[PDB]
Amino acid sequence: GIVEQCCTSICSLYQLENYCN
């Protein structure tokens, strides 16, 4: 999930966008 991907490593804007609706 987002915590597993974006807490250990920094997610770019593009990677964050995956979690949007």
Apex CA 12: angle with CA 9 and CA 15, to 5°? 90
Helix (H) or strand (E) holding 5: helix 2-6
Applying the rule CB under 8 A, the residues between 1 and 21 that interact with another protein are 1-3, 6-13, 16-17, 19-21
Q: How far is the CB of 4 from another protein (least distance, A)?
A: 9
At 6, the amino acid letter reads C
At 12, the amino acid letter reads S
Binding site for another protein (CB under 8 A): 1-3, 6-13, 16-17, 19-21
